[PDB]
Amino acid sequence: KTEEGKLVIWINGDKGYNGLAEVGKKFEKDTGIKVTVEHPDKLEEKFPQVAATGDGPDIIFWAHDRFGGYAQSGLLAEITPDKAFQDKLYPFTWDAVRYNGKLIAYPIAVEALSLIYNKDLLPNPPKTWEEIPALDKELKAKGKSALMFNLQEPYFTWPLIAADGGYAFKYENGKYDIKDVGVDNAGAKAGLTFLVDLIKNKHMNADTDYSIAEAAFNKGETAMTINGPWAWSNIDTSKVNYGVTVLPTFKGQPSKPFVGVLSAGINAASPNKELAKEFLENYLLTDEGLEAVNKDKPLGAVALKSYEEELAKDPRIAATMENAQKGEIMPNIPQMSAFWYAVRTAVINAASGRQTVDEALKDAQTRITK
């Protein structure tokens, strides 16, 4: 047999020392556990680098996107096939970090987006953004707008442009692969087109940055935004009284949200599965593990179906999962850089009138895929 008396856990959430340390203590008091939790910046690069020299006892917790990649070439130990293990979780939060009858980790955070309504000093529309011209027109009359938010990001802005019908990659049983890229479709155009309409007459310019746009809502002269447990985890002074709703409609379709799985997997190759497999299985599946973290946790996030229910208590998660599953999960290849650069260029290509967006970006597909 192989028994030890140490437990290392890597997490980049900034918390969970009381519960993680308190639990392992319990394992120690019975006969063999000492758990440590580190929260560095290179955690991801460090982990695979340390993993390779001589780390051993020590797990890693971070988004699935790079864990996907690292999983392929980086340093994740693609767990083996089980029955009740995968059969005991739910289809959405576990499907985010799931491969063709495979999976290299457990998720613990759902990134998504919901509609928030301003009450006290902000009257919102019933179902269409189309009201902006009208409702914003009224705001203009004084000095404000109905809706304020970012001004150049994918994930969220991407989702809208996705409304009509431009998906990222083509997911087909196997994988998007590469030769099927349908982002730059009539819907991406049509979608960004309606966006261009907004900026075309009211917004006019489009240099409001994340930090600057942040300042805009900071003063609070807008009566509506679309956000969720992903871009704004630590909500700012945005009127205590606010509603929490599902995203709105657009050209007969819902915006495509980017899917986020914050998950801690067991190494690349196989790190003492006996100790980690039992505790994780016997504690994480307890209100002590799952809920001790949760308390440490902030608000939006995840950690196993049962705890999904307890955690679900908050209106955030329910919406967070609803969108997380009905959207696009970041691929699993290094080519993603080709798009971010192409779409950001193309986007800027459409906003200044010097264009060649369809082509620059379309051809981009040709390049990124060929």
Curated annotation (Swiss-Prot):
Keyword NADP found: no
Species this protein is from: Escherichia coli (strain K12)
Family matches, as PROSITE patterns: SBP_BACTERIAL_1 (PS01037)
UniProt-listed NCBIfam families: PRK09474.1 (NF007011)
The protein's name in its UniProt record: Maltose/maltodextrin-binding periplasmic protein
Matching Gene3D superfamilies: Periplasmic binding protein-like II
Record keywords, A-Z: Periplasm, Signal, Sugar transport, Transport
Family: Belongs to the bacterial solute-binding protein 1 family.
Known function: Part of the ABC transporter complex MalEFGK involved in maltose/maltodextrin import. Binds maltose and higher maltodextrins such as maltotriose.
Superkingdom, natural source: Bacteria
Xref: InterPro entries: Maltose/Cyclodextrin-bd, SBP, SBP_1_CS
Compartmental location: Periplasm
One GO CC term, this protein: outer membrane-bounded periplasmic space
Subunit description: The complex is composed of two ATP-binding proteins (MalK), two transmembrane proteins (MalG and MalF) and a solute-binding protein (MalE).
Induction of synthesis: Induced by maltose and the transcriptional regulator MalT. Permanently repressed by cold shock in a PNPase-dependent fashion.
